[PDB]
Amino acid sequence: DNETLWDKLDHYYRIVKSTLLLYQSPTTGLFPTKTCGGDQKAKIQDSLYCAAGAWALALAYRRIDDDKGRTHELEHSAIKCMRGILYCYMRQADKVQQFKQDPRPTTCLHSVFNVHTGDELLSYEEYGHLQINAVSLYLLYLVEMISSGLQIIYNTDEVSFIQNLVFCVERVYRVPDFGVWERGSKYNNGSTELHSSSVGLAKAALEAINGFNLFGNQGCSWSVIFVDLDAHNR
Amino acid sequence: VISNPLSPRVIQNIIYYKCNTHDEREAVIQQELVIHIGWIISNNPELFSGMLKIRIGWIIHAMEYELQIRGGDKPALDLYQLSPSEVKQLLLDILQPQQNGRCWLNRRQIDGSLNRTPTGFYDRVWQILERTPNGIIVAGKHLPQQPTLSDMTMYEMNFSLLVEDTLGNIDQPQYRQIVVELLMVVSIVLERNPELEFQDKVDLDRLVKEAFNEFQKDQSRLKEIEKQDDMTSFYNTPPLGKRGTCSYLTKAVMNLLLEGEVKPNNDDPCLI
Amino acid sequence: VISNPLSPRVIQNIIYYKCNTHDEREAVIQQELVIHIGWIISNNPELFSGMLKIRIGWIIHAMEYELQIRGGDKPALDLYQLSPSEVKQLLLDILQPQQNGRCWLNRRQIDGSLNRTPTGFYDRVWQILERTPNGIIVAGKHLPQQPTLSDMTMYEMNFSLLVEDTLGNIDQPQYRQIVVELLMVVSIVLERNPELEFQDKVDLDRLVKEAFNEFQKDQSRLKEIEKQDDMTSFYNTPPLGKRGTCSYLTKAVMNLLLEGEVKPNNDDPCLI
Ligand SMILES: *C/C=C(\C)CC/C=C(\C)CCC=C(C)C
Ligand SMILES: C/C=C(\C)CC/C=C(\C)CCC=C(C)C
């Protein structure tokens, strides 16, 4: 095992570039569910992981001064997805206001989007869009990448939406959801239930995003996110 | 039935408009305990163990009925006259564990109206439901072995609702508690006694009465009580004792099991 | 009774002068069978497992009764016309571990006459003795709990001799087998149920009597049989089945037991 650390990362460089970074959507930064078939469907939850995979290799790529520009290619591969993931949610900011006031399966943020436009693909009837983890995993990952130095939140207007995204996640203790496998339960009757995996992610998301500056090292008192301690406790 | 949680807007119309219209003040007392229950479930979680459902409306009936016992031959205190702490302290007193100084009739009224079931009762009826071909019949409901066994699990939460639905028709609360002990009795019978299986349907009502009549003949031999079709002599009888309700019940379940085939075990060889 | 090893002289004295005097040929046939059992207990001891006491005569009377059964409605072979080769073959046949297809009543002649208690029977009646403080009264002979449990130990021979001596008043071998299976049933009930114990002097003759009562009323109600107090039909009926003798003994044991008080167990407290 005399290979330089350049060599082992190049081994992993290939895999991401050939198997994940080749298929990253150039427009919305999203990651399509189906690599082949022409499907436009991109899910919120899985696309978060794909960016994190490039992020994980990007942090490994922080250990080389001669990265040949690979680190920024993989660091901002995560940013492109998260901002595209961020971009998709505003596109539905009217739903966010409704879900904040009346948590319901018909007012929630969507979970599947057009990989090439970010437009909504399946309606509430077609697809069960109430998936708290996807919103929670976004907030948990968003602070996770920002703390490492990636810059995803760009202006104070995004701060308000992410702040409002907290208000939606603050109420997942009582709002049932379809969960990660978009089925709801084993019976698959379309009836929503409370899931520990979805509920736990929001608790972790609220824990990390509490008091976290979305602007990173370049931030002040107007870029922190405030989390209701009572809502987290419930 | 609130199977899944709703929003403050929705529960408002359920509390006042659609549920209760006989008396508007029913909601005010109704709205009281659900805060008190919230206090207990946090400070004393164990106290609400064994009950699958907290029917507060029946708790009010339990709340008011015990005062009739507490008040005796006197106009009892009105639940709408007590201060909330008295309602809370009343709630703690009669939902305490070992109900104290209650003729076992009053324990059975409180426990039966309270729908307090033994810990693992739902697990044991599943086992009862497992090795019974013709399921369980309770006062005009039928709990079959199929598709119940195939569609559920022994620890499954869905199965618990069905058995309660099977027992939901027991109008008389102390009859329900007698039903569960009978349901317990066969459970403590069946799991220790793995050879005896039912052949026909298990109608607990027939199991309940036949225990009572064979109960009736012994006490008639003692003092010849002239009350007929009165369960009161059975409820004040303690579950465990010289002649306890369980001992009467197991005789009933012993005979019905004994009217079927004694299956020899491959695991346990027979000496005779 | 040959309790301790003896000399040829005293054995010759007992075999002719003391033990048998009604028929001198009884000594010769017992003599043959003693040497035959010496052959068998040396080659294949597994058949002699089960009968503590090997009673030579009983084995003979059993041989004679087996001859009577085989011959049917004919003057059967008498044991003294049979060659010792025929004696040995028949004795093995009745000593066979398993009886297949025999009328259960004939199996009760074979097992009861041989005193073939099933494996561990003495240990099981020991557990019985511990769990009945008063003790058991058997055909006019009583095993007390004390000072019996203190003097002998669980796995020694003297306790076996005592329990067999108490089982010495079973003139009908079939009665002996029915009480042996009664003891096995009581042992399984007691071991399987540690909350409940026997509350009085344990009279197994009464238990078998009311088991016969149950069988007789059941048969009269079902098949309209006009026979009264007939022990044969109870003997043919098999232990394990839809209607079995072990079932009726178990019902008798439970009926007698359930009069007593019950106590929850410390290791596993009853949940109701
Ligand atoms: C070997 C299996 C048999 C003989 C089945 C019949 C046994 C009974 C019936 C007795 C079961 C009752 C108790 C163990 C308490
Ligand atoms: C909670 C249970 C408490 C005592 C045990 C009651 C169960 C039985 C009393 C009778 C057993 C009868 C059999 C044939 C096994």
Swiss-Prot record, chain A:
Although the final Cys may be farnesylated, the terminal tripeptide is probably not removed, and the C-terminus is not methylated. One of its GO terms (cellular component) is phosphorylase kinase complex. Keywords: Acetylation, Calmodulin-binding, Carbohydrate metabolism, Cell membrane, Disease variant, Glycogen metabolism, Glycogen storage disease, Lipoprotein, Membrane, Phosphoprotein, Prenylation. It is found in: Cell membrane. GO terms for biological process: generation of precursor metabolites and energy; glycogen metabolic process. The keyword RNA-binding does not apply. GO terms for molecular function: calmodulin binding. Belongs to the phosphorylase b kinase regulatory chain family. It is linked to Glycogen storage disease 9B: A metabolic disorder characterized by hepatomegaly, only slightly elevated transaminases and plasma lipids, clinical improvement with increasing age, and remarkably no clinical muscle involvement. Biochemical observations suggest that this mild phenotype is caused by an incomplete holoenzyme that lacks the beta subunit, but that may possess residual activity. Phosphorylase b kinase catalyzes the phosphorylation of serine in certain substrates, including troponin I. The beta chain acts as a regulatory unit and modulates the activity of the holoenzyme in response to phosphorylation. Hexadecamer of 4 heterotetramers, each composed of alpha, beta, gamma, and delta subunits. Alpha (PHKA1 or PHKA2) and beta (PHKB) are regulatory subunits, gamma (PHKG1 or PHKG2) is the catalytic subunit, and delta is calmodulin. This is Phosphorylase b kinase regulatory subunit beta. It comes from Homo sapiens (Human). The gene is PHKB. The chain holds residues 41 to 274 of 1093 of the full protein.
